Structure 1
Amino acid sequence: GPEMVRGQVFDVGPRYTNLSYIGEGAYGMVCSAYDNVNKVRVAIKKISPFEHQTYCQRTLREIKILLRFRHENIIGINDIIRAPTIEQMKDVYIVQDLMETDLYKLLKTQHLSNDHICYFLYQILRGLKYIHSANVLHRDLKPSNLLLNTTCDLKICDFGLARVADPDHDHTGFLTEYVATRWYRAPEIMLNSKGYTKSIDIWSVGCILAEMLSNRPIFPGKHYLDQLNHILGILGSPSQEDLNCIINLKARNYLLSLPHKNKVPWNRLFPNADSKALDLLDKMLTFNPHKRIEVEQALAHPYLEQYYDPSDEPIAEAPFKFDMELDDLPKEKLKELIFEETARFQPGY
């Protein structure tokens, strides 16, 4: 029978054998496996989305985006295993290059040198530059979605929440639900934003930089709204100019109800950090998303001067485009699209 990892069956034989657990997500599990064809150990992610429409949308978007993308700092799809007929297909296995660890695991074991912080940050932004050049957003950047090896190569993974940027439809009401990981949410998520602009990813990168500098999450909110209070606990109360960009009266009245909070200087939090790193951090963790630094500007910052080189930083050929609007289609419709997108990998074809 097929192999089984922590109660989950990975029906990936006979090509991929000798499976071993690596990690897990909301509707996914990741193992390592030996590819008998290529004679290398790979990573395989089992995804089981078909009972829920939202999980099918995200599965389709991640597959279509990662099959289109090709970049050294972004995880790629080597192979997709599913059933020969649409009725036997209940799981999708995505085969990827195996990496050794992720940054979340690494930060539990070690304090990074400034040299390693700088190089990791460079690679995050180099990958992000490519993603944003395609008009795509990752929307869930965090240490556990940054894969590493012992030679300090970095790859961004887990594009389940990725979308094409859509600034015209970014506005939403106060206290709306959000799926991306709480500690890395920009303040506007809780006030007026759906996370449909590039500035959402820059904030998360700033949070990651803070964590590399200190091995502490900078904004560890205990609950949805407490997250915003922690952000203001460092940035201080927003200025009148920034207050005036929030039109939502419920959001604006909430901010005006808070006591005044002082801005906490970065070097109190990070007393041993490179001062150029803290200047870049300041520009990434700007309250106002319209004043927040953009990805190319971040790469061009003095902190990254020893690495920034546009002649060695690929961009996408053109903006990514979804043919049809995925938010409406029922999960049975979405399941057919996923079946079609995976046909090229099936034996035959």
Structure 2
Amino acid sequence: YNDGYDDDNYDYIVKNGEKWMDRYEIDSLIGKGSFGQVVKAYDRVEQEWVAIKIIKNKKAFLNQAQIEVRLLELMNKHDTEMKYYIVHLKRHFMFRNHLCLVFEMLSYNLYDLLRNTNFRGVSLNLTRKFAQQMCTALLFLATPELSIIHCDLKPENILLCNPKRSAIKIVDFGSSCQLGQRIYQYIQSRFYRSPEVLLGMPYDLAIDMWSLGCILVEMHTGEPLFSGANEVDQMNKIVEVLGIPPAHILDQAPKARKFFEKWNLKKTKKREYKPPGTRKLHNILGVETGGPGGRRAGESGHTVADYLKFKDLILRMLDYDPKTRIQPYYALQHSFF
């Protein structure tokens, strides 16, 4: 396959030590996925470590990577500090029938940070810092000339700049798309999938806000707020916390009849899900019990008022209505910040 450089799945065989164009010294394989591979390599010209997204030698993967490159260059064309919360595309080029996207090498993802803790979560102050940076990034994406939906926000796609610092950068704009050029349903990761996407509705930049809500809850608690194994299971675990969705939008839900009957839920058979709205965030966060696991009792920034502000912000971010769901700017003005 491809003179011995590619293989099955159209993936470039990564040989640790190979040099590219007398510039890039391929160190190792740091990641794999549909798109192809990511390699850690050394830019000898700029003398710095970079990540290289090597896209598969299939046509559609190339076209998707080209959409991503155009979105990233469009983000590079807007001069504001907010853009510094997005991973920076350093270069793109074609090498041996593979589109390669050079990126800054960052530290570990937020799921790795959750795993460093014994999935006990991180402090609400670190959650506050992460949330501020994420809302600023989503504000940058909300710029009308951009109007970009990330379409796959998850802890694995939020990386740390330095492992000692609290700065973060969101990565993986492969599934991303502009507000106009939406090209696919089944867009987001299940745990962080917005309701409108589950209901087959025209989605927009609010699905990222939903994902961010679930992500912040998971960051503080250490566990996914909505750990659904399938679509209907995810929707049911959502309703467990947020009740039945506003019919005003279910009267417009193509996939409404997949979860609800005209408006109430569907029988299981089977242990029933917790009645709608009974699983309050209040108890998940532990607003009056010292936080998740009673470990944050008496800690600064972890008072009952701080937990209540966090609960309000999360609920504002988990709004069923995409039009009333909090926008990044007003999310930044929340009392939690």
The 2-side partners of 1:141 and 1:178 are apart by 14
Aligned AA (2:207): I
Q: Is the 8 A contact 1:120 1:154 kept in 2?
A: yes
The count of corresponding residues between Structure 1 and Structure 2 is 287
Unpaired segments ≥5 residues, structure 2: 77-82, 267-274, 292-301
Within the candidate set 88, 92, 112, 2:122 is matched to 112
Residue 6 (structure 1) shift: 10
Residue 303 (structure 1) shift: 0.8
Within the candidate set 21, 25, 29, 1:17 is matched to 25
Residue 77 (structure 1) shift: 1.2
Q: Is the 8 A contact 1:31 1:43 kept in 2?
A: yes
Q: For the structure 1 residues 34 and 162, does the alpha-carbon distance in structure 2 shift closer, same or farther, using more than 3 Å as the test? A: same
Correspondence 1:50-61 to 2 at 5 A: 50-53=57-60, 55-61=61-67
The answer to whether structure 1 residue 37 and structure 2 residue 7 are counterparts is: no
Q: Is the 8 A contact 2:201 2:253 kept in 1?
A: no
Q: For the structure 1 residues 245 and 226, does the alpha-carbon distance in structure 2 shift closer, same or farther, using more than 3 Å as the test? A: same
Aligned AA (1:178): Y
Q: Is the 8 A contact 1:146 1:154 kept in 2?
A: yes
Correspondence 1:192-271 to 2 at 5 A: 192-195=200-203, 197-238=204-245, 242-248=246-252, 251-253=255-257, 254-256=259-261, 258=265, 261-271=276-286
Within the candidate set 136, 141, 147, 2:148 is matched to 136
Residue 58 (structure 1) shift: 2.0
Residue 115 (structure 1) shift: 1.7
Residue 13 (structure 1) shift: 4.6
The 2-side partners of 1:56 and 1:16 are apart by 21
Aligned AA (1:126): T
Q: For the structure 1 residues 275 and 290, does the alpha-carbon distance in structure 2 shift closer, same or farther, using more than 3 Å as the test? A: same
TM normalised by structure 1 equals 0.75
Residue 290 (structure 1) shift: 2.0
The 2-side partners of 1:33 and 1:275 are apart by 45
Residue 181 of structure 1 corresponds to 189
Within the candidate set 312, 316, 321, 1:283 is matched to 316
Q: Is the 8 A contact 1:185 1:203 kept in 2?
A: yes
Residue 120 (structure 1) shift: 0.9
The 2-side partners of 1:265 and 1:230 are apart by 12
Correspondence 1:25-174 to 2 at 5 A: 25-48=33-56, 50-53=57-60, 55-70=61-76, 71-83=83-95, 89-110=96-117, 111-133=121-143, 134-148=146-160, 149-150=162-163, 151-166=165-180
Q: For the structure 1 residues 39 and 288, does the alpha-carbon distance in structure 2 shift closer, same or farther, using more than 3 Å as the test? A: same
The 2-side partners of 1:287 and 1:210 are apart by 17
Encode CA deviations 1:314-333: one digit per residue, 9 max, x unaligned.
Answer: xxxxxxxxxxxxxxxxxxxx
Residue 339 of structure 1 corresponds to none
Residue 14 (structure 1) shift: 2.6
Q: Secondary structure at the match of 2:174?
A: coil
The answer to whether structure 1 residue 300 and structure 2 residue 333 are counterparts is: yes
Percent identity for Structure 1 against Structure 2 = 29
Q: For the structure 1 residues 164 and 36, does the alpha-carbon distance in structure 2 shift closer, same or farther, using more than 3 Å as the test? A: same
Aligned AA (1:16): Y
Q: For the structure 1 residues 262 and 130, does the alpha-carbon distance in structure 2 shift closer, same or farther, using more than 3 Å as the test? A: closer
TM normalised by structure 2 equals 0.77
Q: For the structure 1 residues 146 and 165, does the alpha-carbon distance in structure 2 shift closer, same or farther, using more than 3 Å as the test? A: same
The 1-side partners of 2:280 and 2:158 are apart by 28
Residue 153 (structure 1) shift: 1.6
The 1-side partners of 2:12 and 2:65 are apart by 22
Residue 261 (structure 1) shift: 2.1
The 2-side partners of 1:146 and 1:12 are apart by 28
Q: Secondary structure at the match of 2:103?
A: strand
Q: Is the 8 A contact 2:148 2:178 kept in 1?
A: yes
Residue 190 of structure 1 corresponds to 198
The 2-side partners of 1:227 and 1:120 are apart by 25
Q: Is the 8 A contact 2:55 2:98 kept in 1?
A: yes
Q: Is the 8 A contact 2:85 2:170 kept in 1?
A: yes
The 1-side partners of 2:99 and 2:278 are apart by 47
Unpaired segments ≥5 residues, structure 1: 84-88, 171-175, 305-349
The 1-side partners of 2:63 and 2:93 are apart by 19
Higher mean Cα deviation, 6-15 or 66-75? 6-15
Q: For the structure 1 residues 11 and 193, does the alpha-carbon distance in structure 2 shift closer, same or farther, using more than 3 Å as the test? A: farther
